[PDB]
Amino acid sequence: TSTRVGSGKSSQKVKSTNFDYAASFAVSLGEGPLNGIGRIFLDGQVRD
Amino acid sequence: TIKQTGPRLDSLEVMVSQEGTPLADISGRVAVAGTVIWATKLEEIARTTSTRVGSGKSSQKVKSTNFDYAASFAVSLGEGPLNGIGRIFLDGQVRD
Amino acid sequence: GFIAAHAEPWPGAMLHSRGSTPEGSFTLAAEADARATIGRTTAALPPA
Amino acid sequence: ATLTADRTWRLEGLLRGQRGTDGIVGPAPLPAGAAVVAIDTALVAAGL
Structure with missing residues (x-):
């Protein structure tokens, strides 16, 4: 799972994988x- | 002459939750990890944290709490x- | 649309899901960290 | 705000008319009971 650096690099890198x-x-x-x-x-x- | 084989002793010491073990009672300069005693429970400021999906779902999921x-x-x-x-x-x- | 949540002694994420349908097909739209600070007015005030 | 009781705080030096804060009040004076919410991170406005 990776996160975007937005404008400076790529803004589409975000992932929510489990x-x-x-x-x-x-x-x-x-x-x-x-x-x-x-x-x-x-x-x-x-556990509950 | 009667002798005791040398023990590992202090090296690789780890904190131990159990209180059965007796304290070190050192008579000289030794470094001891020791055994955790009377930890005051824990402070659960934020049990869990979440990840924002931004526009697709919510951008407010992320938490900056301690x-x-x-x-x-x-x-x-x-x-x-x-x-x-x-x-x-x-x-x-x-530590500094 | 602001939705601060007054959790009643609740620890955890608060999920706010918005569904147009009356029955309740809500789609997650927001998440709240914890009980927000909220207050209840006990007085009536003329405009300052 | 001045504490008068454990939950009660007396807001003082109220300032109105910022971004039409007074605009709602002039037609209607504040009611005896209202929910007052501090601006905070918990407040959630996105996702709409």
Whole structure:
């Protein structure tokens, strides 16, 4: 993603592209049946 | 004669959130990263920032506000009276 | 058209989307940083 | 503006007629209740 320098260079360089590498990360918490899933977050206890 | 193999010790020191570790209590001139103690939460002035699309959508999305997490990091290097504090920096020998 | 937003203790971007249709097909037209400073008059004043 | 209360501020030395500020007032005196907004970055006018 890049930004324009306007008149001095090119004014059309602006891009709003999102982050790449979106994937179906499947994290196995272990083998066997599991229950009581709760309190899950990448950086903290939980997300809204 | 009984001996203790030399430890890595201070080199590659990193601040540690956990308080289980005992303080260094240095008796000489050593540089210690220490362990973060009593950080005063964080100051979340702006949680997120946005990018303007100008004419196509909105040119008002951009934010110039200061970044978050300003806090009092009361890192405690060691217990006991201390002196000669100098040459301190997060990433280098010193800040101006 | 000025649209300052008085957020009620809200942290985050405020999305102002304008749609001509009554039902609400709004298209994003503006974004507001935070609650703007706003005031409520408690008095009536003759023209100065 | 002079603080009279935690939210209340008494605007003083009001100046009118700048860019026809007085022009709206002469026909109609200000009502007891109105929304007064400071000029700010949060105010958004573009996208129309």
